[PDB]
Structure formats: structure tokens, C-alpha cells
PDB file of C-alpha atoms and ligand atoms in Angstrom:
ATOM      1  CA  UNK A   1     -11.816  -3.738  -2.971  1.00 40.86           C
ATOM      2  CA  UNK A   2     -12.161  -0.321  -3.786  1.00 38.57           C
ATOM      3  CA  UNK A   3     -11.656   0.118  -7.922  1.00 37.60           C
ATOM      4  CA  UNK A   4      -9.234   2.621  -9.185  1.00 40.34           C
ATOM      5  CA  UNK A   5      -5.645   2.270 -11.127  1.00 37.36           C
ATOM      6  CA  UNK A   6      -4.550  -0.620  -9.095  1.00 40.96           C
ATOM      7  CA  UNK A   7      -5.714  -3.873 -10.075  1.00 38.39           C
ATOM      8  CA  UNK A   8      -8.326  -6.226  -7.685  1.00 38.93           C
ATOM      9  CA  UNK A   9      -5.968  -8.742  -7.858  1.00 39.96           C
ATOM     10  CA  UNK A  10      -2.784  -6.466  -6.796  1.00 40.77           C
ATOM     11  CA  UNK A  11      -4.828  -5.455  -4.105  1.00 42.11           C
ATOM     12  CA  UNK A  12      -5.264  -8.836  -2.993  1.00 42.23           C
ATOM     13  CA  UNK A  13      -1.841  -9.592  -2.986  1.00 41.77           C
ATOM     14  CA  UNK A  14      -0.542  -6.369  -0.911  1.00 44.23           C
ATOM     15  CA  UNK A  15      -3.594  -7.088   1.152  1.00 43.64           C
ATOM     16  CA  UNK A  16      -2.461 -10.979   1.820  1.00 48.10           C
ATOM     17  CA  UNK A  17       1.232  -9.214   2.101  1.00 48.76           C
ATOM     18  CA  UNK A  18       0.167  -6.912   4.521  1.00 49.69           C
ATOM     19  CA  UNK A  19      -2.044  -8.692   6.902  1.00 50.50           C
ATOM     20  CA  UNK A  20      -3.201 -12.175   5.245  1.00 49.79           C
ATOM     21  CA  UNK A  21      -5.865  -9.937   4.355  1.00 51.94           C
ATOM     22  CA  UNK A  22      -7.287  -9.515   7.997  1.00 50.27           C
ATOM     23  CA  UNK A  23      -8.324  -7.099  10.484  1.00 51.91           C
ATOM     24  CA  UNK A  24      -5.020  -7.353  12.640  1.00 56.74           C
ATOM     25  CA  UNK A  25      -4.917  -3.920  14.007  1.00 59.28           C
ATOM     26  CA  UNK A  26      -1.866  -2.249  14.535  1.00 57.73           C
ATOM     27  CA  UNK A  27       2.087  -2.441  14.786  1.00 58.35           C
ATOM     28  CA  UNK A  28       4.709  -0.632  15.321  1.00 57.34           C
ATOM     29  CA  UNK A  29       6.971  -0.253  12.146  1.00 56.04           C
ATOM     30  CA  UNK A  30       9.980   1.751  11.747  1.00 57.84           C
ATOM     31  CA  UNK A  31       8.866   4.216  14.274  1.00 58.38           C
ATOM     32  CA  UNK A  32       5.140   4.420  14.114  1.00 60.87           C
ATOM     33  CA  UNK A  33       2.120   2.670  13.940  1.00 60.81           C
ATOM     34  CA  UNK A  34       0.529   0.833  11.120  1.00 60.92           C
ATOM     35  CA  UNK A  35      -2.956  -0.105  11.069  1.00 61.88           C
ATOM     36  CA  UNK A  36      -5.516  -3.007   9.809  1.00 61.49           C
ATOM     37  CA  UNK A  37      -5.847  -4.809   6.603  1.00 61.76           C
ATOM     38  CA  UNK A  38      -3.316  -3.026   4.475  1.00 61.40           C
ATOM     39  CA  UNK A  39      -1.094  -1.762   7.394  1.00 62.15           C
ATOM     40  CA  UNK A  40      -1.095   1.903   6.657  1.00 59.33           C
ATOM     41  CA  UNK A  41       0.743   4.695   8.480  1.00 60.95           C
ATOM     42  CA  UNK A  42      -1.083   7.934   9.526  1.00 58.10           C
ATOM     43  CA  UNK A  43       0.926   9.575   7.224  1.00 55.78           C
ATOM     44  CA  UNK A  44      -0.102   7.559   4.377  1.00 53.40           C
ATOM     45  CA  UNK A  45      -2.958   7.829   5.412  1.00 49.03           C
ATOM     46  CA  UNK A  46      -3.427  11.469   5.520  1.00 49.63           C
ATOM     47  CA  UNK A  47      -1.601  11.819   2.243  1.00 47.99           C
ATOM     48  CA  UNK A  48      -4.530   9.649   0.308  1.00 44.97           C
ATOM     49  CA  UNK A  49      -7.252  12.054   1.346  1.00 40.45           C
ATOM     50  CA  UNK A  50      -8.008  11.007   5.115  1.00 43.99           C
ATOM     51  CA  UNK A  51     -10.789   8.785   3.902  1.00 44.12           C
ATOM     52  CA  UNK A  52     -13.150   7.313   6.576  1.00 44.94           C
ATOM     53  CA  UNK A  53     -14.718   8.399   9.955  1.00 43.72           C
ATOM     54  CA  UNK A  54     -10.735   8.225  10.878  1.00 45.25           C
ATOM     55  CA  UNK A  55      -7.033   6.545  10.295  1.00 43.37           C
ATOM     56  CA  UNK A  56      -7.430   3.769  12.581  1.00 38.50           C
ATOM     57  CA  UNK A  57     -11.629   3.325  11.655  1.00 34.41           C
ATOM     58  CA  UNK A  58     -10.460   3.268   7.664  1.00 35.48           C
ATOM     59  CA  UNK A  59      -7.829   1.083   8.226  1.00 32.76           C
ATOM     60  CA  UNK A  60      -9.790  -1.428   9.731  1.00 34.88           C
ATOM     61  CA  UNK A  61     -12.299  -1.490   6.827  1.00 36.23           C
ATOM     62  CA  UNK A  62     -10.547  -3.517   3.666  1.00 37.52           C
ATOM     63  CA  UNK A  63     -12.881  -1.393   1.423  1.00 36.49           C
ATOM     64  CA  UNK A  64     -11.406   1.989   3.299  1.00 36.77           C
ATOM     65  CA  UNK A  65      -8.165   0.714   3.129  1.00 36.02           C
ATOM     66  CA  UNK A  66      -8.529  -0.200  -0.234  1.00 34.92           C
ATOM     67  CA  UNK A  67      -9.642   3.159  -1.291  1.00 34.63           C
ATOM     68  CA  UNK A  68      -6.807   4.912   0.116  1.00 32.95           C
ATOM     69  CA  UNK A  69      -4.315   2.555  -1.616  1.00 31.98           C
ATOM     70  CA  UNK A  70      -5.828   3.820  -4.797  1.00 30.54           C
ATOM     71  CA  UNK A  71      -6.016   7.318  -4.037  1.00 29.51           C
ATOM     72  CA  UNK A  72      -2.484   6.826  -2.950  1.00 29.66           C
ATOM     73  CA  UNK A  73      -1.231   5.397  -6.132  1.00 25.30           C
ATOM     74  CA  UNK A  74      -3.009   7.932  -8.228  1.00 25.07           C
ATOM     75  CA  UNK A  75      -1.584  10.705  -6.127  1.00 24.93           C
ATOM     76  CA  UNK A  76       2.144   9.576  -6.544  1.00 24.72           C
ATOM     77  CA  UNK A  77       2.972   6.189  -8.636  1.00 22.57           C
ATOM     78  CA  UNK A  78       3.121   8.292 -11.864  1.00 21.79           C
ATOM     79  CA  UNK A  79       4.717  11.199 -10.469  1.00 22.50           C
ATOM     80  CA  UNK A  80       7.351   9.133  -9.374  1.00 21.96           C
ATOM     81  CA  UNK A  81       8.039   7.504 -12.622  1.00 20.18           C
ATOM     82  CA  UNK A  82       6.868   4.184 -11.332  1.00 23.31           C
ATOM     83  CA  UNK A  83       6.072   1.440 -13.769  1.00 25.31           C
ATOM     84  CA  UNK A  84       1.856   1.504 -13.462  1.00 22.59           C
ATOM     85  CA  UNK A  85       1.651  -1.757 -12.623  1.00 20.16           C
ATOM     86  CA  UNK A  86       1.929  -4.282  -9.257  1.00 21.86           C
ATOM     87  CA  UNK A  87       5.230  -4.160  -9.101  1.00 22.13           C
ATOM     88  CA  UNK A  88       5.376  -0.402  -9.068  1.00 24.14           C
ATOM     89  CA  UNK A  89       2.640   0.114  -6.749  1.00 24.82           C
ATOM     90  CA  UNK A  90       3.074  -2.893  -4.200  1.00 19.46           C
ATOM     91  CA  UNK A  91       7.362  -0.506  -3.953  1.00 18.93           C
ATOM     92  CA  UNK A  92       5.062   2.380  -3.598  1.00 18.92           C
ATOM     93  CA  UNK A  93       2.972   0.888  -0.952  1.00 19.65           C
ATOM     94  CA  UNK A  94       6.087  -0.255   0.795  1.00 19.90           C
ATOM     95  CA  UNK A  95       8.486   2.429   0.464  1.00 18.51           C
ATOM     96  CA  UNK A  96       6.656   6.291   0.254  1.00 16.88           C
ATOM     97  CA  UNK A  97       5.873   8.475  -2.054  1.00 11.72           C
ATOM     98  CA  UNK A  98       8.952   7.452  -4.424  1.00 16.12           C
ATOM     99  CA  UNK A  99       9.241   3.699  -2.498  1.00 15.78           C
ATOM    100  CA  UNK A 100       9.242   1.958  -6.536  1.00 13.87           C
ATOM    101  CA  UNK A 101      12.344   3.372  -6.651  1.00 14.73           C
ATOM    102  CA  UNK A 102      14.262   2.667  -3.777  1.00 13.60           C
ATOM    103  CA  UNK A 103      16.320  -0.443  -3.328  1.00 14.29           C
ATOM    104  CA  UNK A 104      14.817  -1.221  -0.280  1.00  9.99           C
ATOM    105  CA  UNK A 105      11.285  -2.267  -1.623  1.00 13.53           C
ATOM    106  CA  UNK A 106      12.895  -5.074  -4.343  1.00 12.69           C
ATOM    107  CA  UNK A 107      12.731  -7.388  -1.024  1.00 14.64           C
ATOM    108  CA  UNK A 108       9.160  -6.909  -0.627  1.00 14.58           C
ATOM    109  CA  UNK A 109       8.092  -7.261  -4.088  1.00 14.04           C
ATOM    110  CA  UNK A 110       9.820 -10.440  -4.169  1.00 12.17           C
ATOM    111  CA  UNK A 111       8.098 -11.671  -0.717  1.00  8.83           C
ATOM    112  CA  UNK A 112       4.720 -10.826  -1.811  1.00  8.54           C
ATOM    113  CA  UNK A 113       5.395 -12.635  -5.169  1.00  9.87           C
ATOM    114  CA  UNK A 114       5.909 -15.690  -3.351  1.00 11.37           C
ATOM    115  CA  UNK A 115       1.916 -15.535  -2.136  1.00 12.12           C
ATOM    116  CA  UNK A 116      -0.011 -18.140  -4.033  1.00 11.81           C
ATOM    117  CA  UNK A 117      -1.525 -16.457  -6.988  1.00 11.26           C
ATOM    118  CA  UNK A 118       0.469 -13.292  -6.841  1.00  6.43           C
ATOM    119  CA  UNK A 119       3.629 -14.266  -9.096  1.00  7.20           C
ATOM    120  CA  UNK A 120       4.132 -11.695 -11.865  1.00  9.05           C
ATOM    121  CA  UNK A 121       0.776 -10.099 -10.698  1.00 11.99           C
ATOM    122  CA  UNK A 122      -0.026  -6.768 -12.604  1.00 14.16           C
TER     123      UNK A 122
HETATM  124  C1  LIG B 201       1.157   1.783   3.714  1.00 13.79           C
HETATM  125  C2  LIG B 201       2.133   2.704   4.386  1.00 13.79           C
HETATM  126  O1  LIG B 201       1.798   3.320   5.413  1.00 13.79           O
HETATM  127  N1  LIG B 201       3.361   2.734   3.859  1.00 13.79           N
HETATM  128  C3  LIG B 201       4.437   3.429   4.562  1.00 13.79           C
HETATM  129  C4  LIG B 201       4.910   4.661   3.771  1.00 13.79           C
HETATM  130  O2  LIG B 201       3.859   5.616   3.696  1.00 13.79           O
HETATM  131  C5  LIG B 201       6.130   5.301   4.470  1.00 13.79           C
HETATM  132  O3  LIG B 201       6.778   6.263   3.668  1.00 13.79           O
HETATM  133  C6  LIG B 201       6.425   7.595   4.059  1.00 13.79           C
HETATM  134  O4  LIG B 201       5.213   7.990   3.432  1.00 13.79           O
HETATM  135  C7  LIG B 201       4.756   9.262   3.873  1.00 13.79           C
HETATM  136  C8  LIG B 201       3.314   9.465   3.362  1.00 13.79           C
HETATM  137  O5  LIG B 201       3.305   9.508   1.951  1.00 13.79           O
HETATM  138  C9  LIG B 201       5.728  10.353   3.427  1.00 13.79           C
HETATM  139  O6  LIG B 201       5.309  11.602   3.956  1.00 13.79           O
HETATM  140  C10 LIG B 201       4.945  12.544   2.933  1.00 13.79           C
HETATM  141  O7  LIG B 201       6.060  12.931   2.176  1.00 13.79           O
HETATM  142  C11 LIG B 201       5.700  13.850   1.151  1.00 13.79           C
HETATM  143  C12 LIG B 201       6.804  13.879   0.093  1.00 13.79           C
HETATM  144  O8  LIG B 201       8.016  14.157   0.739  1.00 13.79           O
HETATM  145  C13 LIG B 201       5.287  15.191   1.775  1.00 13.79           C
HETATM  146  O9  LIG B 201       4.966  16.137   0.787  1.00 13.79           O
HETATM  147  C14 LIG B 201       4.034  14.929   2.593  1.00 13.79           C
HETATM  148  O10 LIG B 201       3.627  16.066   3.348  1.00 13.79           O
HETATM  149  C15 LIG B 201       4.276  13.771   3.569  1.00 13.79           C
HETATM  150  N2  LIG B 201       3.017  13.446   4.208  1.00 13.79           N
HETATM  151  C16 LIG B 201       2.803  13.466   5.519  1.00 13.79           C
HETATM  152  C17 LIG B 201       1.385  13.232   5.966  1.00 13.79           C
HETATM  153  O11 LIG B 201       3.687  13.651   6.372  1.00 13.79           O
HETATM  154  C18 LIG B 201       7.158  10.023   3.902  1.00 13.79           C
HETATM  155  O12 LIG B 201       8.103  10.886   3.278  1.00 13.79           O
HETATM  156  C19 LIG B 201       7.539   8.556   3.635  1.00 13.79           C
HETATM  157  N3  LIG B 201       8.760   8.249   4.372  1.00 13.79           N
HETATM  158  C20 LIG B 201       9.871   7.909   3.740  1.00 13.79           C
HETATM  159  C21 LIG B 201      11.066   7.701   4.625  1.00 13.79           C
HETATM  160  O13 LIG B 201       9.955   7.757   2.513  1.00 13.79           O
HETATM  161  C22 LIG B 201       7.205   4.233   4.702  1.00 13.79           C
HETATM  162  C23 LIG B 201       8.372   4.776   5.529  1.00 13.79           C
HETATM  163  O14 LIG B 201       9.400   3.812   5.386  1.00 13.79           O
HETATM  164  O15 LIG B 201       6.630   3.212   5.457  1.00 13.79           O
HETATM  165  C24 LIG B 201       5.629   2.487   4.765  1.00 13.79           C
HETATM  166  O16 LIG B 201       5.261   1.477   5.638  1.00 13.79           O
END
């Protein structure tokens, strides 16, 4: 994956979280779409620097994707006063721009820990 703050192996694990790490296209979540390997929303999206030829192209691509994870983490996890590790960015990833702290991401950290390999993944 793309390098940056957030570990290859996190990355794996929100990947295998997201889509088992596949191209799946997209789904509708919550009231709007989200897209490919790491199931990002537009806004998301345009929030880590509208990477790639476009939202749907770069979400496709797990190396576009990828990158956009990173820029996304760099752009808020600290900000947010989220603990710069997994755990803080897979909330992140999950819940927004302050997701690590709401209540509602502890159920997906604990889902994606249950993916061989990614117990107590930093
Ligand atoms: C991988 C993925 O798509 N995860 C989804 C989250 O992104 C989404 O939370 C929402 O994230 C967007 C993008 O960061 C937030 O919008 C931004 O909010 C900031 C701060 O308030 C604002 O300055 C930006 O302009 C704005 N960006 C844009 C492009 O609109 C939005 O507030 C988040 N929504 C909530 C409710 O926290 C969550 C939504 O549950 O879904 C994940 O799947």
C-alpha cells in the first residue's frame, strides 16, 4: 500500500475490514455511497486531497485508496487527539474526522480485530 503514518499491516487489516481487500465497488452506507477496496465516501475522499483521475477511479485502485487513507490520517488523527496507532486510525477511518473518539467506532475496532493477523495490530 501506499507508505505514510499508518502502518502496511493496519492497512491490511482496514483493507480486509473494508472489502476482504477487493475491488467490490460500491454501497450504499448511511446515506451515500462508498467505493472499492477501502470503501471510501466522496467526502472522505475529497477531504484527503482528491487523489486519482477521480473518487470512484481511486477507490478502485488499493494503492489510490491506500494513499488517501494516509493523507487522511495525517490530515486529522492527530488533530483529533487520536492515539497514532491502528486502533486510532482504523475509529478514524470508520467514524470522520474525530471517528477515534466516538463510541460508535469501538464496534468496528473490535470486528476488524477479529481478522486473522489483525489482533492488537498497530
Ligand atoms: C472511509 C470513509 O469514507 N469513512 C466515512 C467517514 O468519512 C464519514 O464521516 C464523515 O467524514 C467526512 C469527511 O471527512 C466529514 O466531512 C468533513 O467534515 C469536516 C469537519 O467537520 C469539514 O471541515 C469538511 O469540509 C468535511 N468534508 C467534506 C468533503 O464534506 C463528515 O463530517 C463525517 N461525518 C460525520 C457524521 O462524522 C462517516 C460518516 O458516518 O462514514 C464513514 O464511512
Amino acid at each position: 500500500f501506499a507508505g505514510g503514518t499508518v502502518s502496511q499491516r493496519c492497512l491490511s487489516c482496514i483493507c480486509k475490514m473494508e472489502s476482504g481487500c477487493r475491488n467490490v465497488g460500491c454501497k450504499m452506507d448511511m446515506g451515500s455511497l462508498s467505493c472499492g477496496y477501502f470503501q471510501i465516501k466522496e467526502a472522505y475522499w475529497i477531504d484527503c486531497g482528491r487523489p486519482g483521475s477521480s473518487w470512484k477511479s481511486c477507490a478502485a485502485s488499493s494503492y489510490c485508496a491506500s494513499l488517501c487513507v494516509q493523507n487522511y490520517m495525517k490530515r486529522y488523527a492527530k488533530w483529533a487527539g487520536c492515539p497514532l496507532r491502528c486502533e486510532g486510525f482504523a475509529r478514524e477511518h470508520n467514524g470522520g474526522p474525530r471517528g477515534c473518539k466516538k463510541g460508535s467506532t469501538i464496534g468496528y475496532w473490535n470486528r476488524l480485530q477479529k481478522i486473522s493477523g489483525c489482533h492488537g495490530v498497530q
